[PDB]
Design a protein around this ligand. Structure first.
Ligand SMILES: [Mg+2]
Ligand SMILES: [Mg+2]
Ligand SMILES: [Mg+2]
Ligand SMILES: [Mg+2]
Ligand SMILES: [Mg+2]
Ligand SMILES: [Mg+2]
Ligand SMILES: [Mg+2]
Ligand SMILES: [Mg+2]
Ligand SMILES: [Mg+2]
Ligand SMILES: [Mg+2]
Ligand SMILES: [Mg+2]
Ligand SMILES: [Mg+2]
Lengths: 95, 92, 85
DNA sequence: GTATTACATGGTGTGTAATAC
DNA sequence: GTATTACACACCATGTAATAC
């Protein structure tokens, strides 16, 4: 329904970790990645990749697909009005 | 699971135009995240995270579900045809 | 399967060549070829162009690529020692 | 200790242009 | 008119290790 703010999933995770009292360092060791990587993820500087989504789901719940879908909606938001599609024809007959 | 309607005008304001008048200032991002989660999930069960304490609401309004925001306060919604229609912010 | 296969399905059933599809969505035919054959990923920015040409939403197209990425990763990452809070 | 980030690097998407029909 | 692919290139995620608080 056109949500006004679409947050990067890393920033959502960071907020949850604050709410759960879990540090970056503890999160890193649990999910098996370097604190550098966790920092960049949580800051929204880098994407939640498929392989991260597997790890994250195992620690934080829901499915990897869910985590990737958040990242996709986010990627799409940032790309809004950056690609001119006005000249692309919609193949097929009009309903 | 796309969100289609709201009952608590206070949430609709934050989701649609991004205005915090009808929600507590400390809970704005926390609620905005839970809503983005509800709109993104394809099915209940992608909303089953221990922090959410997702449980169905039975006996009265069977088919409605409850997610926790902070301490007592909760977000309540109906689930139908893979979507989430009513959206409310209240207690229990 | 690769989301390439579904696109290829639409193109063949609609009588649209790869070359004309490329020109329509604004990329080189090389790019369409690699996409269709599943050699390269359907990126977010491609998903925007493909939705404009073929319909559905970019989210739909990206979701196919994600399911695919995940299938390739199946049983490759040890999560047995990750604790679920 | 915790978190951040420059740096080097490896992986991968894309256009050009050759090679095919 | 059509498709496929080696090459060069640019971007981005990640690991390492230095560093401010
Ligand atoms: Mg980045
Ligand atoms: Mg048409
Ligand atoms: Mg949705
Ligand atoms: Mg620093
Ligand atoms: Mg520095
Ligand atoms: Mg890449
Ligand atoms: Mg490029
Ligand atoms: Mg070049
Ligand atoms: Mg050749
Ligand atoms: Mg040949
Ligand atoms: Mg790498
Ligand atoms: Mg290195």
């Amino acid at each position: 329904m056109r949500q006004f703010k679409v947050s990067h999933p890393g920033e959502m995770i960071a907020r949850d970790l604050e709410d759960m009292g879990v540090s970056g360092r503890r999160f890193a060791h649990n999910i098996g990645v370097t604190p550098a990587t966790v920092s960049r993820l949580l800051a929204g500087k880098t994407a939640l990749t498929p392989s991260l989504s597997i790890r994250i789901a195992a620690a934080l719940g829901s499915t990897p697909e869910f985590w990737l879908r958040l990242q996709s909606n986010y990627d799409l938001r940032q790309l809004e009005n950056q690609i001119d599609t006005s000249g692309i024809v919609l193949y097929g007959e009009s309903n | 699971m796309m969100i289609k309607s709201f009952k608590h005008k206070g949430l609709k304001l934050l989701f649609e135009k991004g205005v915090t008048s009808g929600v507590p200032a400390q809970d704005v991002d926390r609620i905005n995240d839970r809503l983005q989660a509800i709109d993104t999930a394809t099915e209940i069960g992608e909303l089953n995270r221990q922090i959410y304490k997702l449980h169905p609401l039975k006996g009265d309004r069977e088919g409605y579900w409850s997610i926790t925001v902070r301490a007592n306060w909760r977000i309540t919604f109906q689930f139908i045809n893979g979507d989430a229609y009513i959206l409310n912010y209240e207690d229990y």
